[PDB]
PDB file of C-alpha atoms in Angstrom:
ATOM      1  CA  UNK A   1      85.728 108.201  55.866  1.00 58.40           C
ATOM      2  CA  UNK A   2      82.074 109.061  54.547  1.00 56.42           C
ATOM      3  CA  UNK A   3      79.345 106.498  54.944  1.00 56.19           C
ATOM      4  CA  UNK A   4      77.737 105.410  51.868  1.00 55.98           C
ATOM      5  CA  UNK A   5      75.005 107.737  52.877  1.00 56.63           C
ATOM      6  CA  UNK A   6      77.102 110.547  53.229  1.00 58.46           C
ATOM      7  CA  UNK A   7      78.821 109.595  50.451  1.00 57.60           C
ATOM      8  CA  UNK A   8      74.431 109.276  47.995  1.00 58.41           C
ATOM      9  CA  UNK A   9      74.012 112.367  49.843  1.00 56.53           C
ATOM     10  CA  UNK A  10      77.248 113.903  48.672  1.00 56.88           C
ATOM     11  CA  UNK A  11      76.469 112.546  45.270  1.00 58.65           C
ATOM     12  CA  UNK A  12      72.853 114.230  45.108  1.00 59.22           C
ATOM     13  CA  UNK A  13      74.397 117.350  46.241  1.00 60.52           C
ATOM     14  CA  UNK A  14      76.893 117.277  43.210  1.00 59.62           C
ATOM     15  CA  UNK A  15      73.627 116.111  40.771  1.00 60.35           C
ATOM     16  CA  UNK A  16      71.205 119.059  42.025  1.00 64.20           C
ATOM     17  CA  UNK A  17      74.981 121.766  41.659  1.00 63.41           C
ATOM     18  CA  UNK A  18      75.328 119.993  37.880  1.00 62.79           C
ATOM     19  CA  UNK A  19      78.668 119.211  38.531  1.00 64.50           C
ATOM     20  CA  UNK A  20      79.107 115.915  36.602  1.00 60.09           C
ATOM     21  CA  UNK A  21      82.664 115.327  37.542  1.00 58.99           C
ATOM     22  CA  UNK A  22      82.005 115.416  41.382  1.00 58.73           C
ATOM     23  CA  UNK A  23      78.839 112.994  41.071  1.00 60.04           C
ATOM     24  CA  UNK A  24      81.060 110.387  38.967  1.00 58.95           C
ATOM     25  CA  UNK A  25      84.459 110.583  41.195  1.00 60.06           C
ATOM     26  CA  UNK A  26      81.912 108.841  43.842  1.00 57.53           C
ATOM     27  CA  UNK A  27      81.139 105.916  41.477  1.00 57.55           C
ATOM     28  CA  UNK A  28      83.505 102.572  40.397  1.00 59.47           C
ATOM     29  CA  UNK A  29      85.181 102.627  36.815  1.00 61.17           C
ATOM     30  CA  UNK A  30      82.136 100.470  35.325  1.00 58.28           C
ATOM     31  CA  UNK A  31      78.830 101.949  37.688  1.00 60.15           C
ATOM     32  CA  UNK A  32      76.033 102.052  35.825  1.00 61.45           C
ATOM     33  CA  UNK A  33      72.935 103.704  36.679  1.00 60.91           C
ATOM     34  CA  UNK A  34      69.620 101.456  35.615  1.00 62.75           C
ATOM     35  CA  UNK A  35      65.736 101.280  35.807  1.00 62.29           C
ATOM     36  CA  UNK A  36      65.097  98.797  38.613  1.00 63.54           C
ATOM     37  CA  UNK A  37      64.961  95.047  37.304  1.00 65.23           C
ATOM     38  CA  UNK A  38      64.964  96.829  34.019  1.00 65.08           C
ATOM     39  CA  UNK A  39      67.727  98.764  31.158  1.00 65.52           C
ATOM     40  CA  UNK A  40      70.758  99.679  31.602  1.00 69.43           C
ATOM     41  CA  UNK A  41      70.011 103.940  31.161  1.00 68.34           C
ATOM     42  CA  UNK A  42      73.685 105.113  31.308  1.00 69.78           C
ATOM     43  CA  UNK A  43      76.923 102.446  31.335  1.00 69.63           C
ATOM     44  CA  UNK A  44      79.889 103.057  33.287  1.00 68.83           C
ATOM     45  CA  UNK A  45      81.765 105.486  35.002  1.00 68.07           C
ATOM     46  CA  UNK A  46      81.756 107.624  31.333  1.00 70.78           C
ATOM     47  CA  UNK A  47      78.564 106.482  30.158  1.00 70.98           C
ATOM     48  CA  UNK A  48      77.079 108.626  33.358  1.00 68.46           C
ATOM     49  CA  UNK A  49      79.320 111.111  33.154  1.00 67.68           C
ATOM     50  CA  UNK A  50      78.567 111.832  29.529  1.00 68.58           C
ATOM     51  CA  UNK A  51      74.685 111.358  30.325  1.00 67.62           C
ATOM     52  CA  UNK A  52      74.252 113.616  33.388  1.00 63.30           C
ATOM     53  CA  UNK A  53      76.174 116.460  31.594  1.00 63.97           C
ATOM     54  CA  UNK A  54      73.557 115.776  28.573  1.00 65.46           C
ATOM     55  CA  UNK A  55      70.519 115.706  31.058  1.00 65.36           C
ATOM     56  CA  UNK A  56      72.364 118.941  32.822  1.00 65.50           C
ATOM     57  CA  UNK A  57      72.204 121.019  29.321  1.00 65.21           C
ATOM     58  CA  UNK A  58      68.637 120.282  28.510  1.00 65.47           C
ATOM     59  CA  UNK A  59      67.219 121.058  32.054  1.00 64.60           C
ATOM     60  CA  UNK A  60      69.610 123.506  33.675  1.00 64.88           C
ATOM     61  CA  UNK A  61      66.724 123.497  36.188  1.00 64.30           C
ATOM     62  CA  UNK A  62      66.831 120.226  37.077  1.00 63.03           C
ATOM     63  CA  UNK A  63      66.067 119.298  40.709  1.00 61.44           C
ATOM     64  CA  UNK A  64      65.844 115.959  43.054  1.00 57.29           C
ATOM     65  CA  UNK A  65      64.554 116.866  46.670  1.00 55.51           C
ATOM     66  CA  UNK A  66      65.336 113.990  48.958  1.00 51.39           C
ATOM     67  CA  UNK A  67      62.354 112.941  50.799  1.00 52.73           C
ATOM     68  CA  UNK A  68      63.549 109.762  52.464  1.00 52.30           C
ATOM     69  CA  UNK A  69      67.705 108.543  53.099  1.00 51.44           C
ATOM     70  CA  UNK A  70      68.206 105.280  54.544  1.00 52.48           C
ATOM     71  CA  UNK A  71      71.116 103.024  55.107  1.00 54.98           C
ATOM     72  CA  UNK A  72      70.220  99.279  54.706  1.00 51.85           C
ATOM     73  CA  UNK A  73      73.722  97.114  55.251  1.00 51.92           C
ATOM     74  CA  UNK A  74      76.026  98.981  52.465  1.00 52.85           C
ATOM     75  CA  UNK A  75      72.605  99.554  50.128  1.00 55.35           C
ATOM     76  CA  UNK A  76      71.642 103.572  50.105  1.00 57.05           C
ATOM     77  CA  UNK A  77      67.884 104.132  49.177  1.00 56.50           C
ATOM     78  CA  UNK A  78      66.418 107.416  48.808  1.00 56.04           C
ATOM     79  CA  UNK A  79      62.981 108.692  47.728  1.00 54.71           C
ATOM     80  CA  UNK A  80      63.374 111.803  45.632  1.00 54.69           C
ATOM     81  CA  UNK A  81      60.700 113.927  44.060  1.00 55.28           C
ATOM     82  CA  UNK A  82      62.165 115.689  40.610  1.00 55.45           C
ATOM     83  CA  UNK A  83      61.582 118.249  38.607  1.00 59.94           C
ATOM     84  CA  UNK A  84      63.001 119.049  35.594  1.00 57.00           C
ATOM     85  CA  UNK A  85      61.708 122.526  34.960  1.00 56.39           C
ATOM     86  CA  UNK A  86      61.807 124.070  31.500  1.00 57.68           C
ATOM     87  CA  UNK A  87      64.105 122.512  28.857  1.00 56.69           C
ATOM     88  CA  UNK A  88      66.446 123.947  26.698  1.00 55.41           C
ATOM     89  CA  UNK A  89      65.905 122.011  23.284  1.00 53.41           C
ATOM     90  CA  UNK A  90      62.204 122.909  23.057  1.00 51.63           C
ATOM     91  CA  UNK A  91      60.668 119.567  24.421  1.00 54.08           C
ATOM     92  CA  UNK A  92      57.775 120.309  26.876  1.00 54.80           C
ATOM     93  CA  UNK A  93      57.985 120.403  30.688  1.00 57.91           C
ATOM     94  CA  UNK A  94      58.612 117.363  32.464  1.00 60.77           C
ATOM     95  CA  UNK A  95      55.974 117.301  35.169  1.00 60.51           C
ATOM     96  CA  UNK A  96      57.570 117.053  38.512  1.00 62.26           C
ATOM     97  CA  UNK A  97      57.954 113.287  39.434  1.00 64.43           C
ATOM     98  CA  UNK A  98      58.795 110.434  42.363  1.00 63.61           C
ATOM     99  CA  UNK A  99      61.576 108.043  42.417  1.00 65.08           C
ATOM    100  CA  UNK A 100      63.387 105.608  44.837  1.00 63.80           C
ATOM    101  CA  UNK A 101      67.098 105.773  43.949  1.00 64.17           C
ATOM    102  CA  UNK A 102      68.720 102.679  45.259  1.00 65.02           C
ATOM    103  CA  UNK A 103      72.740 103.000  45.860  1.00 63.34           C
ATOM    104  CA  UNK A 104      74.540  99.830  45.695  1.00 59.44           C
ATOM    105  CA  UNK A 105      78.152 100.124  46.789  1.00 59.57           C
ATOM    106  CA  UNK A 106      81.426  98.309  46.208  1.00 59.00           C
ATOM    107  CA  UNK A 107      83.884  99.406  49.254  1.00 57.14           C
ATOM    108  CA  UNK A 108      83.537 103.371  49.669  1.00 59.23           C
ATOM    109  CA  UNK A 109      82.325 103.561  45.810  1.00 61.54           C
ATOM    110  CA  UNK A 110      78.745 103.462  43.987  1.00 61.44           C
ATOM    111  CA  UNK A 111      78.725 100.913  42.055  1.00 61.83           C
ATOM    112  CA  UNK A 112      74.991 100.783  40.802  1.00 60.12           C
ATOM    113  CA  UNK A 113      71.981 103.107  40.901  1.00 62.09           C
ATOM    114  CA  UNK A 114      68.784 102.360  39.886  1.00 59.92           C
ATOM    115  CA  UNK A 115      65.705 103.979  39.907  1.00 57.84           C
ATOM    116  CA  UNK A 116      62.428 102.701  40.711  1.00 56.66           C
ATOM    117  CA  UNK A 117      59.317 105.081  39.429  1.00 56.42           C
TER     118      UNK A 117
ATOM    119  CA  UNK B   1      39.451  97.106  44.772  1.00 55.36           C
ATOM    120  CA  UNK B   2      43.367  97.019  46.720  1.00 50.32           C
ATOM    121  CA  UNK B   3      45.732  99.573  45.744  1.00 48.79           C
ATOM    122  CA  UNK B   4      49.388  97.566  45.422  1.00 49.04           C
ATOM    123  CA  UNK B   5      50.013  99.280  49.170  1.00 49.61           C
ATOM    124  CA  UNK B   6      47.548  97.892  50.145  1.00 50.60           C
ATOM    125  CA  UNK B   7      48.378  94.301  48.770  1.00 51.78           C
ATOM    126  CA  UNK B   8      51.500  94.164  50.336  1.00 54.21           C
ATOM    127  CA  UNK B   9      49.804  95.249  53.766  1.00 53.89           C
ATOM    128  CA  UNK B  10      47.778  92.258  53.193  1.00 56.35           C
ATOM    129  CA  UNK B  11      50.736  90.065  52.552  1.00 54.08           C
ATOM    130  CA  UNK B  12      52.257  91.043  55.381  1.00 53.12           C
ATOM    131  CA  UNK B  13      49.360  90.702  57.663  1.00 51.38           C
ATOM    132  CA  UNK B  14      49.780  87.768  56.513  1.00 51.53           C
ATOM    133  CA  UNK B  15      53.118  86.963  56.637  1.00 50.87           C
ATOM    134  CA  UNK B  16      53.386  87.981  60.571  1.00 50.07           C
ATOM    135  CA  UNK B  17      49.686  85.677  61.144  1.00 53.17           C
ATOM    136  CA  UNK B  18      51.906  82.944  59.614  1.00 50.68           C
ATOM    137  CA  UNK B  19      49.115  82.369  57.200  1.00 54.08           C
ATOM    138  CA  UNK B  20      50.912  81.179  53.997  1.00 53.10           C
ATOM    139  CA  UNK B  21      48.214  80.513  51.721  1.00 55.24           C
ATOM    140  CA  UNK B  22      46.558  83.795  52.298  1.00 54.80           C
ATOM    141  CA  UNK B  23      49.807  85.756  51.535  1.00 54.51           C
ATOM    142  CA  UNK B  24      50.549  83.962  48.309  1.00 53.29           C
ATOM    143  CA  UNK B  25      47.181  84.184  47.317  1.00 52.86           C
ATOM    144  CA  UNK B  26      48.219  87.846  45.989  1.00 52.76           C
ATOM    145  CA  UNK B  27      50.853  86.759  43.852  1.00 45.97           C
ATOM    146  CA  UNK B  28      51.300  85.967  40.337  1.00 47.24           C
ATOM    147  CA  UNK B  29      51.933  82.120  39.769  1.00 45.43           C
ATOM    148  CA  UNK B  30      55.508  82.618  38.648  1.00 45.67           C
ATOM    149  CA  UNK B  31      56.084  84.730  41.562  1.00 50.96           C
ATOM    150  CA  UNK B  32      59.607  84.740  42.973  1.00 49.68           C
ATOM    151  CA  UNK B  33      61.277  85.638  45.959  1.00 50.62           C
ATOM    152  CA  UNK B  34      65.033  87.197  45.690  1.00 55.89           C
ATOM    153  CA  UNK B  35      67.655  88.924  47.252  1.00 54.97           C
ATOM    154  CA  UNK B  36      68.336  92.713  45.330  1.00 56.19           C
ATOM    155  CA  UNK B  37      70.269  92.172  42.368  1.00 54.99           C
ATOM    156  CA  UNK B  38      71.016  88.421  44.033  1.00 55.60           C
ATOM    157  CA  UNK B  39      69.633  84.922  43.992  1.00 54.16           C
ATOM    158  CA  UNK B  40      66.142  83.592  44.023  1.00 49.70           C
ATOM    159  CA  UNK B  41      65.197  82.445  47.499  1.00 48.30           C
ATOM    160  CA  UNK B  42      61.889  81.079  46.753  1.00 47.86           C
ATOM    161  CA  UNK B  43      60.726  80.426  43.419  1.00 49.70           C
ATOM    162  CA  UNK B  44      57.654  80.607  42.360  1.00 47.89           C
ATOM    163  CA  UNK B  45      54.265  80.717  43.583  1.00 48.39           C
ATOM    164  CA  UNK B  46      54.314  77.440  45.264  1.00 49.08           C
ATOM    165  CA  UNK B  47      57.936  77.517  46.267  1.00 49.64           C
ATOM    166  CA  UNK B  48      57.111  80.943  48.131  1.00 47.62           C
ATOM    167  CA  UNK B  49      53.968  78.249  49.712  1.00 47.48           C
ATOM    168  CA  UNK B  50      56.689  75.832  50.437  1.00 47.64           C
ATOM    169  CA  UNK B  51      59.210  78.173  51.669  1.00 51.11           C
ATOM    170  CA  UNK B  52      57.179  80.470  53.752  1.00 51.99           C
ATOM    171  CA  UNK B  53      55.603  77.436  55.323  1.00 53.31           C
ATOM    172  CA  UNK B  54      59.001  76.023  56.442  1.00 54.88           C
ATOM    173  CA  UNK B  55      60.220  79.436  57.883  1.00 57.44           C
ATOM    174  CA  UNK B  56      57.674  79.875  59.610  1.00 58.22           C
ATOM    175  CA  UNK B  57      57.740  75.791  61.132  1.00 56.76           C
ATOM    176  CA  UNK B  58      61.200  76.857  62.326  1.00 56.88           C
ATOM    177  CA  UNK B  59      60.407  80.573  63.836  1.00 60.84           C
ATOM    178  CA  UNK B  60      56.797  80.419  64.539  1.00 59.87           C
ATOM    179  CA  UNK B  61      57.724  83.681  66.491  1.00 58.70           C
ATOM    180  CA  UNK B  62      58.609  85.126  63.653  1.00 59.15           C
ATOM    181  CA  UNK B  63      57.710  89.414  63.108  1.00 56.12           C
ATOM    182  CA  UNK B  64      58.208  91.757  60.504  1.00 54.94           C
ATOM    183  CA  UNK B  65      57.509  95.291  61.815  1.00 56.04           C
ATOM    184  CA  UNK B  66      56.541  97.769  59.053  1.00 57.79           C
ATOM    185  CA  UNK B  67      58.956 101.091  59.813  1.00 56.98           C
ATOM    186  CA  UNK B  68      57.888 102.498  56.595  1.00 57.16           C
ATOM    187  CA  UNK B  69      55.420 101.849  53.897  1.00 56.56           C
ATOM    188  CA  UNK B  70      55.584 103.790  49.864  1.00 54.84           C
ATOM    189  CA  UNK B  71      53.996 103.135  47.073  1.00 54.39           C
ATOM    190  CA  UNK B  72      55.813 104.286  44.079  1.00 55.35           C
ATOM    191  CA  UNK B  73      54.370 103.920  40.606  1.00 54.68           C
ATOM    192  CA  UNK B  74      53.049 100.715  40.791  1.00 53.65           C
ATOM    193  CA  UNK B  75      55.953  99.558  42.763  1.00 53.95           C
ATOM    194  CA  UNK B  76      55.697  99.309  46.960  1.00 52.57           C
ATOM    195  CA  UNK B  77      58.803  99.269  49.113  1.00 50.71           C
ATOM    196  CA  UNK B  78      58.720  98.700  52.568  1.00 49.81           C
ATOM    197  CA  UNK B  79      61.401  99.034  55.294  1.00 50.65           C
ATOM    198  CA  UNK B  80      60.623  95.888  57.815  1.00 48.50           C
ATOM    199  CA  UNK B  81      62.522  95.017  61.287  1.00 45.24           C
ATOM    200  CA  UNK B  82      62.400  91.778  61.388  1.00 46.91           C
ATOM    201  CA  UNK B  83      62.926  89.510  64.535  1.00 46.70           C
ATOM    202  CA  UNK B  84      63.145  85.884  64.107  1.00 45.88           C
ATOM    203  CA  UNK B  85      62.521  84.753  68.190  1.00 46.45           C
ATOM    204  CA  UNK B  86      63.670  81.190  69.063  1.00 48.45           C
ATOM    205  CA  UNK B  87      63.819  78.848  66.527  1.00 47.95           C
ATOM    206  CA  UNK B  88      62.393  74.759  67.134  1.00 45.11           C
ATOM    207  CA  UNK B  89      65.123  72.989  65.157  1.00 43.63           C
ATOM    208  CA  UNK B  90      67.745  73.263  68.254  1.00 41.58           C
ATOM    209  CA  UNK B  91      68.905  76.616  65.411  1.00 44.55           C
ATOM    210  CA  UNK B  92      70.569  79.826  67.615  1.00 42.06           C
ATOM    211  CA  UNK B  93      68.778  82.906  68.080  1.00 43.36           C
ATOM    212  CA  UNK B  94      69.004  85.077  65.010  1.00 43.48           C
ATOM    213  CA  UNK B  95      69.810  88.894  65.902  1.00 43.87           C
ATOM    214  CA  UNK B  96      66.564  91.090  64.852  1.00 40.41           C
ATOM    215  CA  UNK B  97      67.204  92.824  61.364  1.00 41.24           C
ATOM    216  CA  UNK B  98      66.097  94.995  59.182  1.00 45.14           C
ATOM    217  CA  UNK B  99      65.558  94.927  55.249  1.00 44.57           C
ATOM    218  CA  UNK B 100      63.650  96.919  52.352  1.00 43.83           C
ATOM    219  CA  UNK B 101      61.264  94.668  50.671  1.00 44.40           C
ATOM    220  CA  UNK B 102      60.550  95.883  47.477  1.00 43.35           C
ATOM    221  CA  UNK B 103      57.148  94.415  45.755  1.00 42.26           C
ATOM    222  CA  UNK B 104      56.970  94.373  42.269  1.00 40.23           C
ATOM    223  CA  UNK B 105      53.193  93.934  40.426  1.00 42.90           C
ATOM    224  CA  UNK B 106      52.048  93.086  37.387  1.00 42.74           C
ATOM    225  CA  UNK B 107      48.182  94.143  37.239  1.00 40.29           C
ATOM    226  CA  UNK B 108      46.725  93.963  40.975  1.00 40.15           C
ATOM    227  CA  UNK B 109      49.053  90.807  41.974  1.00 37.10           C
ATOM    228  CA  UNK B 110      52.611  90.561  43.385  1.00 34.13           C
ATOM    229  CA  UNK B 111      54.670  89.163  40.411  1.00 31.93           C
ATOM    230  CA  UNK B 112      57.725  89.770  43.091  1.00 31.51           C
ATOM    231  CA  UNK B 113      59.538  90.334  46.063  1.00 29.98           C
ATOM    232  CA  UNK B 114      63.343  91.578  46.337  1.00 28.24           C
ATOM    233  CA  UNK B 115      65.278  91.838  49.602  1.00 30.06           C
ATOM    234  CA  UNK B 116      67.552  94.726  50.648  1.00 31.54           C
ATOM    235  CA  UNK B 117      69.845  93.740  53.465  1.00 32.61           C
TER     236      UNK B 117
END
């Protein structure tokens, strides 16, 4: 079916609609996503489902535009600039920022994203 | 002086003038070498000496082409095709490929270098 590309880009589609449920069905049971050689930010399939719908509630705003999609072997890496916009809980605005999101994938399913910034 | 793009430009200069001393010259002196979430390759500072020096004794043709060249935070990632040529130790010809090396730095040296492949 999808490549794993198709299948980030599907997922980054589903992040910038909030819809939590389509981002996760993507991912294995136990996907985290992670800071690059660094913390664990949300664990598992639930931990990220539970996380992105928190993120989703206090920026309804929220906004990655992909700036770079590659396919390296079954990796996924894409450079994404972000913006938050205006919170809901009163916390001041996030000024718009750069990442590389690197996919890793198991079969057809993300099993790992981490973020370099 | 460098910016950490520009380090890794350096390094890779380098790297493709098969000039190992000069390339690990911007590293940290616990520097490793090490596949994306996967084993150290060379380890170290002087194992990257070592290492590099005996890759390069085998493929003294050896080329990485820079496709693509970020620097994010303090972070730089760079998408390399890589082509081997013929090797002296009777090896066969390895099949150009390409890889993200991603270039961690701690102050204005390279405290690492992950392959994605």
């Amino acid at each position: 079916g999808m490549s794993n590309l198709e299948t980030a880009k599907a997922m980054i589609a589903a992040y910038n609609a909030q819809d939590v449920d389509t981002y996760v069905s993507y991912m294995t049971d136990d996907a985290c996503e992670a800071n690059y050689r660094g913390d664990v930010v949300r664990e598992g399939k639930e931990g990220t489902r539970s996380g992105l719908a928190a993120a989703f509630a206090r920026w309804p705003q929220n906004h990655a535009e992909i700036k770079d999609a590659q396919q390296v072997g079954t990796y996924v890496l894409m450079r994404e600039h972000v913006t938050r916009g205006p919170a809901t809980d009163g916390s001041p605005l996030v000024e718009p920022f750069d990442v590389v999101a690197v996919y890793s994938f198991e079969g057809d399913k993300c099993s790992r994203v981490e973020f370099i910034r």
